[PDB]
């Protein structure tokens, strides 16, 4: 499950759009995927890189940067084998996406609904009702 | 006269406006020979200027201290040709355009595809409608009273507040 | 032959190794410069940077200042340089207070004690460099002019 | 005359430009023969 | 209501509140909004149809 | 972070989750709609607030509702 | 013979059916409107051919026929200028007395008192004074008759009919295949050799056989009806040899390479004709003959069907060094498969050429009596500055469209584009720094001078009387160009332009051209120019380089070239598209070009234009106030805008009252634009909801539901009205000012 740090990376001639000091002091994101070919893709941070046949590893500064490459790899090269991780400066590796092995767009058992409101949006409480009280505006 | 104004026919400032306006054109006419096309054009401009001032003087308009005609629009009948009567002509034409357009949008709603009738106008039907506008005050008041102009408040989309 | 490579042999870092960024001449100059010099105390780093900056600050204030045409142009220029040094040393002090949490180690600029030592050195160097510029310009007539003394 | 060319001349920009040019044209002609009408004459 | 009937929307936050649409289908399960109403006017989103409950819909 | 809510008018079309660039939304089983599923937001800390989920929502009033709140490095879209 | 003509015959049927179905060209719009946004979306995407069709062949065919339609419109426009010169002009009166009669080719009808616009332009004529310089073109052509202007109007009309026929024919009857359009070597050979080269050769031939004899007779003092007709020079070689004795030897000196015989009519004089204040037409004839030879020679560079020539792919792929990776590999594939890449290059070049045209045409006036017609000089400079700036921003617009749409990373690995996108942060940060440095060190000098002058400290300013920022390099280059005749251009007789130094050329006691001295004010306004050009480059480049992705939006190419935002999140991504950098850079182009035309207008009036008094003193139009007053912003406000706006404000009741009306109308339109620029769509949609309610109440709601304009369209409408209002304000101000005083 855990990120194999030794995964080889795509051939990129470098760019100025990559990650800055906050990646080494706050958080860094990594994306891995398996490619059947030695093919050119576009980096979210700049120009073009070549993903290697076999397993690739990337280091990006944002989760949207990782998910942008994930969509490019799924719509143009049909890779569904992408795992997105958040790597703390402490060295902790946090797996992110897909969070339970199944894509968010597919239903999965054991998922608990968060943020779900039992009524429609027009039944939200008016702000005057919730003023000077801790009671929430979603009913 | 009204509002301390003077009739334009006896105000000296209107007369000096006419005289100065004709002197400007006569000094432009003084640099051309008699039969030339610019001189003929300038003389017709002088004739139009004199006709305008002559007509305004005998029209019952009231001039200011500046010698320009002023319009009295308080409703008095001795000055109704400056706003009340031109306004009645406007409201007749404006209500014509409004009644004709309203009749066409109500026709276009009953079409097979209502929105093509508004970018590609059914010109024979729309010309039937432009002919309808001459009796719009009666047509629209009968429309109003027969419950066909105003829709009830519970048939109109409104915001939640 | 390629003269531009990924920075630090890391392609996804946000930098490119280039001749301007990573030549041996650039590496030698940065290491030689007091801010990045190895073996240099933070106070000594501040003294060398301060001596440099205070020395060249006097000249624009002296030559182009409001009192430039007056005979007190150098004194005004030195005072203006000194005032700018005091404002900048206040800036260094406040940056040090907010940026760095207090730690025992002082061997680095990026420490509360080290930046305080750096600011101390920068003030001493800047006032000394400004003073050195004042002494030199006052003594040398050519420096008092803009190089037109020969003319 | 072709029905598709007449359906093109019935389009909103063509009718708008022709009708407002006709409208502009009789305002111009009415101000040519009867100029300087500041008032309804009465 | 029933399928194909013309209905007046009573959902205050609807785009077509107090407008007329026509009912396409009504589900029979435990669905929270079974009445599917289609509308001639399109919403700001461009959608011209929405699912509503019975107590948000009146026959005309 | 932002607060993202899903209301029970959700028809389970899965479009808001597909729109999500930051894996904030996912599908959970729900018997309320014909599709048998409703959107959920267990990752609103990654929510940047783009409101692409709202655009993809085909309900008359978006079942998915983003309420922009406290800003973080993640919700500001900062790569620095 | 791999370069061949290949055409599909009868591709598209000439039918009115698609005319009657607006929106037919796209799948979205063809299902009809449901909201009023459709109406706007119809016009917005119509010429976006590569948004409708997948195939490059149909796109290229649509572009070729639309270029013929544009050429038909240009020829109709030219035919109208010739017809208005023939029928509604004082051209014949202007030919007799070019220095007193004012050019006019537009007469108004007397309708609502508007016949005051037929002012007394001279020559027993009343009309609107025209400033396009056509009269000077026609005199340079040797027209000398209104009959020949009618024949030119018919020639333009015939060409307009032939181009509209050719567009119909080449879209509907014989449309070329894609392999025809992808012949860049053949097209370049023909557009260098045939279009530009035979264009110059034929024009040089016309100049030698028509313009040179007629203009020698005109400047000798012969009246226009006493001048022999232009074919009598073609036949009577004896009569042509009276004016130019080299014609006694014919074409033997050309073929025997004895070209110094032709020095009577092929000169290298330089400078201006003293009689007209224009370029020597013998120099212009030699100029066009020399350009024709090089353009024809250039059009033999590329390989088409016989093994001689270059492959442009080989030229590009061979140019690669150690800094630039694979080099120019893949650029030929880009420029023969992307129309937007070609339009980006050609619009940047056409705009640059139009900007070059404005500088060169004022400095070296090329037509007879154009230099002392100051309304024409100001008009054609200002016009070609605006055409240049607009075309340059469209070069960046279509660079953004190329990057968003036609750019493929797979075919662009490690080439020049890949490397630019891979160091775009370094490019934009260094451009950002130079723009901050140059706004501080150009406009802050103005703020320094405003402050010091306001404070009573005139000794503390950047001025010629105080701290002198002299333009030593520009003055030195002026020195070189004044010393160049006889030294570094030994066979030149005069300087390339009198702007560099030298004589004052006066025609009809008005200065044709005279040295433009550069001082502190010129240093300051040139660094203002360098600053405004740099910032326009920064906005346009930042849009091109960040069109596909950023650190902010990593998937910006999926949103497109023209999107409003990607939501209020990430702090807010309003105006994140490449389109919105074209939108923001057209304002800074407006700013740049407005300062350029203001610098030109004030400097030429203050230091160049004016009347030559006895003893050669030149009393200038604004009396040399540029040097001591263009160093402060208050001087630009007071001595340029306030002082020279006198003519537009006081134009009422005269022939220039139309300019006063357009001055006010354009102030109105400019302000009206700010309603679209400072506001947002959501306000207007809720306001429209209340208006829709009032329509619903009267049962008069439209079936095409009214919408507020899109966010992008609100930006585009605001920018279009802003540009129209600002440029129309400057247009009215410039034209009333210089018609009154020059
Ligand atoms: C292309 C450049 C050009 C320009 C800008 C002008 C401009 C002008 N011309 Mg000139 N003209 C031109 C070319 C041009 N002309 C050419 C090529 C010829 C030779 C045929 C002429 C011959 C000519 C003459 C003989 C005269 C002018 C006159 C005029 C003036 C008024 C014209 C007018 O009011 O028409 C208005 C006429 C109308 C019929 C009104 C137009 C309303 C309709 C609806 C136009 C709509 C177009 C249509 C909707 C497009 C779609 C087609 C349809 C199938 C949908 C104006 C200054 C007049 C002038 O200067 O008098 C002093 C004048 O007498 N022109
Ligand atoms: C020597 C031959 C030749 C010449 C003169 C031209 C001329 C032109 N081409 Mg090119 N073209 C050529 C060969 C040539 N082409 C070849 C071989 C190809 C295939 C690879 C193309 C492919 C091509 C494309 C794809 C496009 C052009 C376009 C254009 C026009 C550019 C706009 C312009 O400045 O026009 C104004 C200048 C003029 C001189 C207008 C005159 C118009 C005619 C056609 C010029 C020639 C007339 C005749 C030869 C002169 C006889 C002289 C006689 C009186 C003695 C211009 C008319 C563009 C365009 O606008 O399309 C219409 C365009 O998109 N051409
Ligand atoms: C804002 C104030 C105001 C308003 C609303 C009006 C409105 C009117 N005035 Mg009054 N007026 C005003 C101020 C005002 N006036 C002032 C300050 C003066 C200066 C003293 C006048 C002097 C004035 C005179 C002298 C007359 C009017 C008349 C009228 C009427 C015009 C025609 C009409 O409907 O007659 C009714 C006609 C029809 C309903 C149908 C006719 C077809 C109208 C009711 C005229 C009128 O009719 O008096 C009642 C009239 O003779 N006005
Ligand atoms: C909503 C404001 C407004 C109003 C009430 C008027 C009203 C009038 N205008 Mg003015 N006008 C307006 C806006 C307005 N105009 C605008 C916006 C412009 C600029 C485009 C003009 C420019 C203008 C001119 C230049 C002329 C008028 C004329 C006229 C008169 C038209 C009578 C007519 O057609 O007789 C025509 C004859 C018939 C028999 C009918 C009338 C006094 C004319 C007039 O008579 O001036 C007093 C005239 O020459 N108007
Ligand atoms: C919106 C477009 C537009 C409009 C309306 C005008 C309008 C005008 N131009 Mg300008 N012009 C424009 C764009 C425009 N220009 C651009 C983009 C360029 C750069 C190529 C120029 C360059 C230009 C020149 C160089 C001259 C004008 C002139 C004129 C005036 C007379 C019109 C005429 O017959 O030209 C006739 C043009 C000539 C008689 C000279 C043409 C010489 C050029 C070099 C021919 C080049 C042709 C070739 C196909 C260009 C290919 C582009 C190249 C980069 C490959 C008129 C004010 C003339 C003027 O101001 O006289 C007072 C003039 O000498 N124009
Ligand atoms: C495309 C442009 C063009 C065209 C169509 C022509 C056409 C012509 N030229 Mg011109 N010419 C041109 C460009 C052009 N020339 C250029 C660029 C130059 C400068 C080198 C000349 C210099 C020139 C001279 C000096 C003469 C001609 C002559 C002629 C005529 C040839 C008669 C002959 O052979 O007698 C040639 C006589 C011999 C003894 C041999 C013919 C009308 C002759 C003519 O009749 O002049 C009116 C003539 O004497 N041409
Ligand atoms: C040779 C020049 C050239 C060519 C062929 C094109 C072609 C194209 N451009 Mg480019 N562009 C150009 C010059 C050019 N443009 C310049 C000079 C600029 C800078 C202003 C731009 C800026 C630009 C942008 C920012 C965009 C395009 C787009 C487009 C495409 C479709 C445009 C469309 O359908 O509009 C149809 C035409 C109109 C809607 C006309 C309205 C424009 C103004 C408001 C009218 C002007 C009126 C008049 C001049 C002044 C008003 C007078 C008043 C008093 C009555 C098409 C590929 C768009 C696109 O789809 O990208 C693919 C796009 O987003 N271009
Ligand atoms: C007159 C109004 C005005 C001013 C002053 C500015 C100023 C600036 N713009 Mg803006 N802009 C404006 C109008 C203005 N803009 C408008 C109307 C638009 C409409 C679209 C834009 C669109 C726009 C874009 C799209 C871009 C700019 C950019 C810039 C910067 C240029 C770099 C520069 O010159 O830095 C120098 C700073 C100045 C010249 C500001 C004036 C300061 C003077 C010199 C004195 C300084 C006073 C001093 C600090 C006093 C300190 C004491 C006090 C604090 C107590 C700068 C911040 C560019 C940018 O930021 O990138 C570099 C850029 O890309 N602007
Ligand atoms: C510009 C200065 C210059 O002479 O550049 C020239 C230098 C030339 O590189 P190359 O020798 O690799 O060029 C080879 C081909 O690309 C040229 O056809 O380009 C760079 O090194 C990048 C410079 C970017 C701009 C830096 C500032
Ligand atoms: C006024 C305004 C509107 C409302 C404007 C609308 C709905 C335009 C409608 C104007 C009428 C309906 C047509 C305009 C016709 C003009 C008389 C001339 C138009 C010329 C071309 C359209 C042909 C917006 O929708 C908007 C959106 C985003 C930012 C700013 C704004 C904004 O400022
Ligand atoms: S889009 Fe709206 S409806 Fe479709 S799933 Fe997400 S929330 Fe439920
Ligand atoms: S806002 Fe953007 S990120 Fe937050 S949920 Fe909706 S889509 Fe996913």
Token pair recorded at residue G723? 């540009």
Distances in Å between the Cα of C87 and the Cα atoms of B15, C50, C91, G192, G515 are 75, 14, 6, 64, 49
- How many CB pairs below 8 Å do chains B and G form together? 72
A34 φ, ψ to 5°?
A: -100, 130
Q: Do C16 and G460 touch (CB under 8 A)?
A: no
How buried is D9 (Cβ within 10 angstroms: 0-12 exposed, 13-18 middle, 19+ buried)? Answer: middle
Q: Chain E within 8 Å of A120 (Cβ-Cβ)?
A: yes
Apex G373 CA angle, G371 and G379, nearest 5: 95
Q: Which residues contact B76 (CB under 8 A, 6 or more apart)?
A: B2
Cα G404 versus chain centre, distance? 27
Torsion of CA G716, G719, G725, G728, to 10 degrees: -90
Rg (CA), chain A: 20
Distances in Å between the Cα of G546 and the Cα atoms of C11, G550, G552, G599, G726 are 20, 6, 10, 33, 29
CA–CA dist A44, B151 (Å, integer) = 55
CA F50 – ligand 12 centroid, Å: 5
The one-character DSSP state at A53 is S
Q: Which residues contact G98 (CB under 8 A, 6 or more apart)?
A: G139, G276, G368, G369, G508
Q: Which of G31, G34, G37, G701 to mutate to test the interface with E (most CBs of E within 10 A)?
A: G34
Q: Chain E within 8 Å of B131 (Cβ-Cβ)?
A: no
Query: What proportions of chain D, in percent to the nearest 5, are helix, strand and coil?
Result: 70, 0, 30
Residues G326, G320: contact at Cβ < 8 Å? Answer: yes
Residues G725, G668: contact at Cβ < 8 Å? Answer: yes
Please give the annotated binding residues of F for [4Fe-4S] cluster, written as ranges. Answer: 10, 13, 16, 20, 47, 50, 53, 57
CA–CA dist G625, G742 (Å, integer) = 17
CA–CA dist G2, G183 (Å, integer) = 10
Distances in Å between the Cα of G334 and the Cα atoms of B71, C93, G64, G371 are 69, 55, 19, 44
Q: Which alpha helices (H) appear in G207-302, and where do they start and end?
A: 212-220, 230-235, 237-243, 252-255, 281-298
> Residues preceding discontinuities in chain D at C–N > 2.5 Å?
none
Contact map slice: C 88-147 vs A, CB within 8 A: none
- Strand pairing of A116-117 and F3-7? parallel
Q: Which of G14, G36, G112, G704 to mutate to test the interface with D (most CBs of D within 10 A)?
A: G112
Q: Which of G323, G326, G413 to mutate to test the interface with C (most CBs of C within 10 A)?
A: G323
Distances in Å between the Cα of G290 and the Cα atoms of G56, G268, G617 are 38, 11, 39
For chain C, the first-to-last Cα distance in angstroms comes to: 52
Cα A122 versus chain centre, distance? 33
Cα G432 versus chain centre, distance? 27
Rg (CA), chain G: 29
Apex E14 CA angle, E11 and E17, nearest 5: 65
G164 ligand 8 Cβ < 6 A: no
What residue owns the CA closest to ligand 6's atom 40? G251
CA torsion sign for G308, G313, G316, G318 is negative
G289 ligand 6 Cβ < 6 A: yes
Distances in Å between the Cα of G112 and the Cα atoms of B48, B72, G117, G622 are 11, 24, 11, 36
Pocket test for ligand 5, best of G378, G384, G385 (most atoms within 8 A of CB): G384
For every residue of F18-53, DSSP letters joined together read HH-TTS--EEEE-SSSTTSEEEE-TTTTS-----HH
Please state the three-class secondary structure of G169-229 as a single string.
HHHHHEEECHHHHCCHHHHHHHHHHHHHHHHHHHHHHHHHHHHHHHHHHHHHCCCHHHCCC
| Nearest alpha carbon to residue G681 among G712, G722, G703, G705 | G712
CA torsion sign for C10, C13, C18, C23 is negative
Q: Chain F within 8 Å of E13 (Cβ-Cβ)?
A: yes
Q: Which residue of A has its CA nearest to G403?
A: A47
Token pair recorded at residue B158? 């409104």
Choose among G413, G414, G421: nearest Cβ to A46: G421
Torsion of CA C40, C42, C48, C53, to 10 degrees: 150
The one-character DSSP state at G14 is -
Helix-helix angle G339-363:G374-401, to 10 degrees: 160
CA G716 – ligand 10 centroid, Å: 11
**Residue B34: half-sphere exposure toward Cβ, Cα within 13 Å:** 0
Q: Is residue B96 a known part of a binding site?
A: no
Count of CB atoms situated within 10 Å of the CB of G55? 10
Nearest-ligand number for the alpha carbon of B73: 3
| Nearest alpha carbon to residue B104 among D15, C93, G422, G107 | D15
Q: Chain E within 8 Å of A91 (Cβ-Cβ)?
A: no
G691 ligand 10 Cβ < 6 A: no
What residue owns the CA closest to ligand 3's atom 26? B76
Token pair recorded at residue B71? 């319009």
Which atom of ligand 5 lies nearest, measured to the CA of G195?
49
Q: Which residues contact C55 (CB under 8 A, 6 or more apart)?
A: C129, C130, C132, C133
What residue owns the CA closest to ligand 10's atom 12? G706
For every residue of G538-603, DSSP letters joined together read HHHHHHHHTSS--SS-TTHHHH-SS---S-S-TT--TT-SSHHHHHHHHHHHHHHHHHHHHHHHHH
For every residue of B48-106, DSSP letters joined together read HHHHHHHHHHTTT-EE-TTS-EE---SS-GGGTTTTHHHHHHHHHHHHHHHHHHHHHHH
How buried is C104 (Cβ within 10 angstroms: 0-12 exposed, 13-18 middle, 19+ buried)? Answer: exposed
Helix-helix angle G339-363:G56-87, to 10 degrees: 30
Q: Which residues contact G383 (CB under 8 A, 6 or more apart)?
A: G358
CA distance G15 to chain D (A): 8
CB-CB neighbors (< 8 A) of F14 in chain A: 105
F3 φ, ψ to 5°?
A: -115, 125
- 3-state secondary structure at position A42: strand
Q: Which residues contact A90 (CB under 8 A, 6 or more apart)?
A: none
Residue position matching structure tokens 């267990």: F42
Residue position matching structure tokens 């922009």: F68
């Amino acid at each position: 499950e855990t990120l194999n740090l030794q995964i080889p990376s795509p051939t990129f001639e470098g760019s100025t759009g990559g990650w800055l000091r906050a990646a080494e002091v706050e958080e860094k994101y990594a994306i891995t995927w398996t490619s059947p070919k030695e093919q050119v893709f576009e980096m979210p941070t700049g120009g073009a890189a070549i993903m290697r046949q076999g397993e690739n590893l990337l280091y990006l500064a944002r989760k949207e940067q990782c998910l942008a490459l994930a969509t490019q790899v799924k719509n143009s090269f049909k890779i569904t084998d992408y795992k997105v991780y958040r790597i703390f400066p402490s060295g902790e590796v946090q797996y992110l996406h897909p969070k339970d092995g199944v894509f968010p767009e597919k239903v999965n058992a054991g998922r608990v609904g968060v943020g779900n409101v039992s009524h429609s949006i027009g039944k939200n409480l008016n702000p005057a009702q919730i003023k000077f009280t801790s009671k929430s505006f979603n009913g | 006269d009204v509002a301390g104004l003077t009739p334009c026919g006896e105000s000296k400032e209107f007369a000096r406006r006419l005289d100065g306006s004709v002197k400007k054109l006569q000094t432009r006419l003084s640099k051309y020979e008699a039969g030339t096309p610019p001189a003929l054009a300038l003389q017709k401009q002088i004739d139009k200027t004199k006709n305008r001032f002559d007509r305004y003087g005998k029209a019952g308009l009231l001039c200011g201290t500046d010698g320009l005609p002023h319009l009295i629009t308080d409703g008095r009948w001795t000055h109704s040709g400056e706003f009340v009567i031109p306004g009645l002509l406007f409201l007749y034409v404006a209500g014509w355009i409004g009644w004709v357009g309203r009749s066409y949008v109500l026709f276009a709603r009953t079409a097979d595809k209502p929105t093509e009738k508004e970018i590609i106008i059914d010109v024979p039907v729309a010309l039937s409608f432009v002919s309808t506008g001459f009796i719009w005050p009666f047509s629209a008041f009968k429309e109003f009273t027969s419950g066909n102009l105003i829709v009830p408040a519970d048939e109109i989309t409104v915001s939640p507040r | 032959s390629q003269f531009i490579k990924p920075y630090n042999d890391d392609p996804f870092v946000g930098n490119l190794a280039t001749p301007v960024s990573t030549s041996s001449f650039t590496k030698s100059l940065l290491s030689n410069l007091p801010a990045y010099r190895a073996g240099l105390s933070p106070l000594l780093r501040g003294v060398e940077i301060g001596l440099t900056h205070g020395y060249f600050l006097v000249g624009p204030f002296y030559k182009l200042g409001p009192l430039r045409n007056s005979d007190v142009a150098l004194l005004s220029g030195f005072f203006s340089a000194l005032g700018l040094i005091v404002i900048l040393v206040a800036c260094l002090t406040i940056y040090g207070v907010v940026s760095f949490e207090e730690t025992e180690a002082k061997d680095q600029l990026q420490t509360a004690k080290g930046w305080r030592q750096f600011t101390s050195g920068w003030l001493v160097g800047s006032v000394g460099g400004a003073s050195f510029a004042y002494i030199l310009i006052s003594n040398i007539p050519f420096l008092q002019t803009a190089g037109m003394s020969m003319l | 005359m072709d029905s598709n060319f007449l359906k093109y001349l019935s389009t909103a920009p063509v009718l708008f430009t022709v009708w407002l040019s006709f409208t502009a044209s009789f305002i111009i002609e009415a101000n040519r023969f009867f100029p300087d009408m500041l008032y309804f004459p009465m | 209501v029933k399928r194909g009937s013309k209905v007046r929307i009573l959902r205050k936050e609807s785009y077509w509140y107090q407008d007329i649409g026509t009912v396409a289908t009504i589900d029979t399960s435990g669905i929270r909004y079974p009445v599917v109403v289609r509308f001639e006017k399109v919403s700001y989103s461009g959608v011209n149809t929405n699912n509503f409950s019975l107590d948000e819909v009146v026959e005309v | 972070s932002h607060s993202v809510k899903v209301y029970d008018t959700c028809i389970g079309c899965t479009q808001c989750v597909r729109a999500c660039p930051c894996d904030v939304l996912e599908m959970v089983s729900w018997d309320g709609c014909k599709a048998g599923q409703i959107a959920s937001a267990p990752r609103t800390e990654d929510c940047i607030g783009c409101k692409r989920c709202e655009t993809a929502c085909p309900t008359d009033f978006l079942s998915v509702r983003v309420y922009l709140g406290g800003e973080t490095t993640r919700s500001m879209g900062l790569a620095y | 013979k791999k370069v061949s003509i290949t055409v599909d015959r009868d591709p598209v049927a000439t039918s009115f059916e698609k005319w009657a179905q607006p929106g037919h060209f796209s799948r979205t719009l063809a299902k009809g409107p449901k909201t009023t946004t459709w109406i706007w979306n119809l016009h917005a995407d119509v010429h976006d051919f590569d948004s409708h069709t997948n195939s490059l062949e149909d796109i290229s065919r649509k572009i070729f026929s639309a270029h013929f339609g544009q050429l038909s419109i240009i020829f109709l426009w030219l035919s109208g200028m010739y017809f208005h010169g023939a029928r509604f002009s004082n051209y014949s009166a202007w030919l007799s007395n070019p220095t007193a009669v004012k050019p006019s080719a537009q007469v108004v009808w007397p309708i609502v008192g508007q016949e005051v616009l037929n002012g007394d332009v001279g020559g027993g004529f009343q009309g609107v004074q025209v400033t396009s310089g056509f009269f000077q073109i026609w005199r340079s052509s040797g027209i000398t008759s209104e009959v020949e202007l009618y024949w030119c109007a018919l020639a333009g009309l015939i060409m307009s009919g032939l181009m509209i026929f050719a567009g119909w024919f080449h879209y509907h009857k014989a449309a070329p295949k894609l392999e025809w359009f992808q012949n860049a070597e053949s097209m370049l050979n023909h557009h260098l050799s045939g279009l530009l080269g035979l264009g110059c050769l034929s024009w040089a031939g016309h100049q030698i056989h028509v313009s040179l004899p007629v203009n020698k007779l005109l400047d000798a003092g012969v009246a226009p009806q006493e001048i022999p007709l232009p074919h009598e020079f073609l036949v009577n070689r004896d009569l042509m040899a009276q004016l130019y004795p080299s014609f006694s030897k014919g074409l033997v000196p050309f073929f025997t390479l004895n070209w110094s015989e032709y020095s009577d009519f092929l000169t290298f004089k330089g400078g201006l004709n003293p009689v007209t204040g224009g370029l020597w037409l013998s120099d212009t004839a030699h100029h066009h003959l020399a350009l024709a030879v090089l353009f024809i020679v250039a059009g033999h560079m590329y390989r088409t069907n016989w093994g001689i020539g270059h492959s442009m792919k080989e030229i590009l792929e061979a140019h690669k060094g150690p800094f630039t990776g694979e080099g120019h590999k893949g650029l030929y594939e880009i420029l023969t498969t992307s129309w937007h890449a070609q339009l980006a290059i050609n619009l940047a070049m056409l705009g640059s050429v139009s900007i070059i045209v404005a500088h060169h045409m004022y400095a070296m006036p090329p037509y007879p009596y154009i230099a002392t017609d100051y309304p024409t000089q100001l008009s054609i400079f200002t016009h070609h500055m605006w055409i240049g700036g607009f075309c340059v921003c469209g070069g960046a617009a279509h660079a953004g469209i190329f990057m968003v749409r036609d750019y493929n990373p797979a075919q662009n690995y490690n080439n020049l584009l890949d490397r630019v996108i891979r160091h775009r942060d370094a490019i934009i940060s260094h451009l950002n720094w130079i723009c901050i440095f140059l706004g501080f060190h150009s406009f802050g000098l103005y703020i320094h001078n405003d402050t010091m002058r306001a404070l009573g400290r005139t000794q503390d300013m950047f001025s010629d009387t105080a701290i002198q920022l002299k333009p030593v390099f520009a003055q030195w280059v002026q020195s070189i160009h004044t010393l160049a005749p006889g030294n570094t251009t030994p066979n030149a007789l005069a300087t390339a332009s009198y702007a560099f130094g030298g004589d004052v050329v006066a025609v009809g006691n008005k200065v044709a051209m005279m040295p433009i001295s550069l001082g502190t004010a010129d240093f300051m306004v040139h660094h203002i120019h360098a600053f405004t050009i740099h910032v326009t480059v920064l906005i346009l480049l930042k849009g091109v380089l960040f069109s596909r992705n950023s650190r902010l939006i990593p998937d910006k190419a999926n949103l497109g070239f023209r999107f409003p935002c990607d939501g209020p999140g990430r702090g807010g991504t309003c105006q994140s598209s490449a389109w919105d950098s074209v939108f923001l850079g057209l304002f800074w182009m407006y700013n740049c070009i407005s300062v350029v035309i203001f610098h030109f207008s004030w400097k030429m009036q203050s230091d160049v234009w004016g009347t030559v008094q006895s003893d050669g003193t030149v009393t200038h139009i604004t009396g040399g106030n540029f040097a001591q007053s263009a160093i402060t912003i208050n001087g630009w406000l007071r001595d340029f805008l306030w002082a020279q706006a006198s003519q537009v404000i006081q134009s009422y009741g005269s022939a220039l009252s139309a300019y006063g009306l357009i001055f006010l109308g354009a102030h109105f339109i400019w302000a009206f634009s700010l309603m679209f620029l400072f506001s947002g769509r959501g306000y207007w949609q809720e306001l429209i909801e209340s208006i829709v309610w009032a329509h619903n109440k009267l049962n008069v709601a439209p079936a095409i539901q009214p919408r507020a304009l899109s966010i992008t369209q609100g930006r585009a409408v605001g920018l279009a009205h802003y540009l129209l209002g600002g440029i129309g304000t400057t247009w009215a101000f410039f034209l009333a000012r210089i018609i009154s005083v020059g």
